[PDB]
């Protein structure tokens, strides 16, 4: 298509309207006095959210040039989120701020390429400063405070996160999903358990639960489909002699084999149960191996050239108890010595280290938890669906910020950390005067989040900023209680990694943007 | 697509118009002096209805913002309905109320997030208050009153519901369907019966009904298709010796087997009949098991490795009489001891407890009824189809409210319960003044349903509310007889669970709503 | 789609223009001075008709609201017709009347829900009153009078209907179809006959008719296709010995068998004929059973495990004569004793009682006639096609009204019955004044049909109604002769069931309609 090209101040002015429409939709939500935005949906009911990256992905503008502005700053908000899943509004606010100020200096006749260099120097400096202010967050109380503050001041989320973090340990997963009732609820599953039900409801020796239960059972791990019962006989009978029940975790148990197993368990011959293997594809075999290790058994796959028939009792895993539902098997307390348990865990330790992907990382951490600590699920309660969505998202949001606190620390919120690092770099200079403005451009933007937080309360940003600026260390403004104080004492903690990412990402794009001199796009 | 974004008072005004159009099409229908709305349909004739969620789901507006408003309140009405099938208009009315008043206070310059906290606090309070006013509704008289009142003052609906509730008992289903004539009619099927006709009209030993009848018959339950008669012989002959007739409920009876059975029953050899199994898929086998239990027989499926041939008389169920039509089998009085009956019922008791779905819940409750109490059908009469639709809906509607009465109790209608819980909270306060206004915003809306009820009679809401406000307990206004009195004595009872759900849902959304500060949506 | 919602008097006004455009197109046709409407057709030539439900179905309006109007009153005319195939214009006229009046009182500020209650009470009362004026119509003369009056005063239709009703008896069908010439013609087939021709034109022993004729023939009823002649031999030869001819009614006679039969009959071996079974699917077997009964033969189907070979002469049905054309077999006078005939008829008597369908009802009544009375056909004559359509329709129309007279009786026409029940309810009252207007609203509409009859004559409705109102019993106005008199004596009889369905249906929807307060529909 034919293009519309626009140059210099003209192009920039459109660019900024672009940034501004997005920035302004995203700002309304900053801080405890944040407000919500409503994003429409051709789908079904609209969505009410407080979450900056949600609002930001929706903004698309009709003027092709305004649009390019908005589609650019939009990535600060987006990246901020893939990085720590929080602080996306802050980020946006900082970029709108670096760009506003920067462009105004380009209009003063400064060389943008230097404005940029100064802005990045300013920033690299601020990042060190942050790492210096950061203090570790490692007690349950602090963790609760980052949760809480992330969840727009929902003390309950704070607590629940803090609680879960506590039970599943350091290497345990926590996930959030819709709840049944109105109140939030925390499930913690003990030890190892996966997503597989009995293959026939006949195995069920306890109908009141609708679930199967065996004690001191041997476990047969077969990495292959099971059709012929012939393959079993030498084994099933070695077990009938030891007088103990048996779990069968194979790739699958089909008609011919299953039917007969079902007939055999029924008549009170040998107590048995069978259930599909966890997952599919490649991880199945590796994850079935997990199960081997935990119960001290040997995987029987046709890959190492093995036959079910040639398997003595010894190959079988063992545990003290197992529990299986319509769609959930669980092994309690495996015989595997913690020598071998700890070892296999020290292997899947480095699986994550060289997991060059994001999805190849999730699963490994899951397995680590099923073998080491525990798995926790939070359920968010809500009266409505418009409510579930927003509430769920905040818990999700805070879940992330705590994980961030834990690895990177905390600094004073209400954008005090940033305002503080700005005074620490009051003396930073670059290779030339433009660069010095460039630096000053960033220091000034570093006041933005506190300034919006305040404006969203309907008081005066420059009065609050002045008195915060007049103090020291962690003195800051409590927007919620409208009083000044020590931000760490008041429990207003930002996870250091988020304050940091918001600065980096926002500067990284704002930086580029202010060096636009030409813009090319389609004809209306 | 390029978006239109709107901010603050601007966006809200539009949002309100949107709420308002919907809320006012819903209002017209509130209470005994309600009027109906006509909803068009590209389909066939329009639809006349009084039912608030029906009107609501139709409203869609041309201003994309006004629409957003409307599509949002629309969920209070919707949720209300998935929750108790009733009170949807009240709900709507309350939300229109909480919003109007709430936005007015945002324009006052209150912090909407607090307005929300006050509103919720006000509501959590009001729910407790209602659970306190609730009294159990458990006689047949009260039940009739809830029915009656739900069916816009139709005493006959009240009575039929009350009557059915009484015969099918507490674990019995009641369903409504179109009737043949002009008058309503209540069918109650006694004990166990399902949707299956004879497999050949030849079995029919009584042509005058066009139906089959056997006394003291054995029952053969086969969980498998039946093609070969060979499989039958050992059994059919053990039955010919005992001189009793035989029912065959299998997965199916096809050509070869059936034909011969048909030939055998014909010649006066052995009195037999055959009929498909109930349902399909997985429930068939479980439900066929029901039939086993009720008649004290043993299911014969190839899954436990069983053969028809190896079945003595003993495996066969038995009853005192069976009745089968073109499409309805029914077993009268099974031999199964109530020891085993009561037990299998205590199992399907907890099937519903862990039925994590809505459709996996319907079927279980059905079976419970076929095994415990009874099944009842109501037929709604009407001269026309425009009439049938509206009348059927109301019966359905009241059917729901009585089920709600029964599980959660009744409170005073005419929106007296709500007006009373508002004076109980005259002292509620929150953390800060905005929250106090927030609280007051809700208490105020709690007057809405009575004030519409009154307006819809064309008298003066604030006069009626003032004198109701001036009494005590259950004094209220009888809009139908235009006189004051005790609302429970006058049989104007609301089911507690609906009054409460109306409040909850409407507050739940209106609450979020009043905290919109930005709105994003498409270009016209 | 975005909707256009309309509220109170506004939405009503549009609703009523709606009812009006329809009501008016329908009115023009009412009574003997009725006129015709022309309804266009993308198809072929337009359609000239007098028939209210025909005009009505066409009306659809451009104003989405006016349209709703129209599409709703449209249902009175529609139901009216499914219910007694007549009175549909009167119906229409009463609804336009109940609406007009009703709405005018909602404008007075009555409570429409009560307007409605009184309009129904009024009506329930009127229906009793009609059942009380109704006198049975059971001589051939009165029957002619209902036909005649139904057929816009076509004495010839009256007569023909009366004539048929007389010959086919009470359980005989009468159908109307296009005729060959210009004059109407009544065919009456005697006894049993169906739609099947010889399977080979060679069977024909009388070429002058082009048809087959056998006397004292045995009848072979085979419920199965016939391919092998082997299956026949034992039988064909038992018949060759008795020296009588043979009819073969099987599911079909194909190549191999047929060919040989054809060769055998040809050479003067044994006199035989063959013809397909009546209908297909399930009724075939049941209907072939009919033929069995009538001729005292035994159906030979492989379903009861039977073979053609094992059939002696005894199994064969018998009659005194049979007559078969290119597409019509007919059996004259079967040997079956009326003990068994009457019985099988007493079974298909209750087939109709429990025929829960409309199509499962037509066939049964057919069979009843082929076994009990006779079948009659009327042929309508016309010069043109524009003419055949309208005439045929009227005969059809009157065919219905007579069937209705016969089951429910007659009342005085020209709208006199309704005007008389109206003075009988002069004292009816309801629970409150609004209901009293509502009563009075209906009693007034009850004058509508006489008022239109008169206006269609171009005289003055309120002079005619005054004088008619001034008389008694069956005094009324003969619109055709423009003189007053006793309407029963002048043969102006309306079948009671129609006068009552007109009232029922019109009030049933008019009733709802006047309780519209909102109307929702699409944007233009
Ligand atoms: N009581 C409070 N006073 C001042 N700031 C607060 C208070 N509570 C939370 N905050 C601050 O709110 C800021 C961000 O909240 P949020 O609106 O989610 O922005 P983001 O999406 O950028 O995380 C953090 O700086 C946190 O310090
Ligand atoms: N005689 C009456 N006087 C005052 N209120 C009544 C009377 N009869 C019924 N109501 C009130 O009607 C209200 C609801 O009727 P309805 O129009 O179905 O609204 P909803 O759809 O909100 O259930 C209930 O609060 C009930 O108390
Ligand atoms: N000579 C007559 N005088 C008055 N009314 C008549 C006369 N002939 C027929 N009618 C009346 O005509 C009315 C209906 O005829 P018709 O136009 O078909 O209306 P509908 O479709 O409503 O049957 C009946 O009420 C019948 O009594
Ligand atoms: Mg945040
Ligand atoms: Mg209701
Ligand atoms: Mg007529």
UniProtKB/Swiss-Prot annotation, chains A, B, C:
SUPFAM superfamilies registered for this protein in UniProt: GroEL apical domain-like (SSF52029), GroEL equatorial domain-like (SSF48592), GroEL-intermediate domain like (SSF54849)
UniProt xrefs under Pfam families: Cpn60_TCP1
Cysteine disulfide partners in this protein: none
EC number: 5.6.1.7
PTM annotation (N6-succinyllysine): residues: 33, 50, 116, 276, 320, 389
Gene3D superfamilies: GroEL (3.50.7.10), GroEL-like equatorial domain (1.10.560.10), TCP-1-like chaperonin intermediate domain (3.30.260.10)
MF annotations from Gene Ontology: ATP binding; ATP hydrolysis activity; ATP-dependent protein folding chaperone; identical protein binding; isomerase activity; magnesium ion binding; unfolded protein binding
Stated consequence of mutating residue 397 to A: Can bind ATP with normal affinity, but is defective in ATPase activity. Binds non-native rhodanese, but cannot release the protein
Main subcellular localisation: cytoplasm
GO BP terms in the entry: chaperone cofactor-dependent protein refolding; protein folding; protein refolding; response to heat; response to radiation; virion assembly
InterPro entries: Chaperonin_Cpn60_CS (IPR018370), Cpn60/GroEL (IPR001844), Cpn60/GroEL/TCP-1 (IPR002423), GroEL-like_apical_dom_sf (IPR027409), GROEL-like_equatorial_sf (IPR027413), TCP-1-like_intermed_sf (IPR027410)
Modification sites for N6-acetyllysine: 116
Annotated CDD domains: GroEL
Binding site for ATP: 29-32, 50, 86-90, 414, 478-480, 494
Catalytic activity: ATP + H2O + a folded polypeptide = ADP + phosphate + an unfolded polypeptide
Keywords in alphabetical order: Acetylation, ATP-binding, Chaperone, Cytoplasm, Isomerase, Nucleotide-binding
Statement: the UniProt record of this protein carries the keyword Cell wall biogenesis/degradation: no
Record text on subunit structure and interactions: Forms a cylinder of 14 subunits composed of two heptameric rings stacked back-to-back. Interacts with the co-chaperonin GroES. Can form asymmetrical complexes, composed of one GroEL and one GroES, and symmetrical complexes, formed between one GroEL and two GroES oligomers. The asymmetrical complex is the functional unit. It was suggested that the symmetric heterooligomer may represent a transient intermediate in the chaperonin protein folding cycle.
Protein task: Together with its co-chaperonin GroES, plays an essential role in assisting protein folding. The GroEL-GroES system forms a nano-cage that allows encapsulation of the non-native substrate proteins and provides a physical environment optimized to promote and accelerate protein folding, probably by preventing aggregation and by entropically destabilizing folding intermediates. Also plays a role in coupling between replication of the F plasmid and cell division of the cell.
Swiss-Prot/TrEMBL domain comment: Each subunit is composed of an apical domain that binds non-folded proteins and GroES, an intermediate domain and an equatorial domain that binds ATP and is involved in inter-ring interactions. Forms a large central channel that appears to traverse the entire length of the cylinder with no obstruction. The central channel of GroEL functions as two cavities, one in each ring, that are separated from each other by the crystallographically disordered 23-amino-acid C-terminal segments of the seven subunits. The entry and exit of polypeptide seem to be restricted to the apical end of each ring.
Official protein name in the record: Chaperonin GroEL
Source organism (scientific name): Escherichia coli (strain K12)
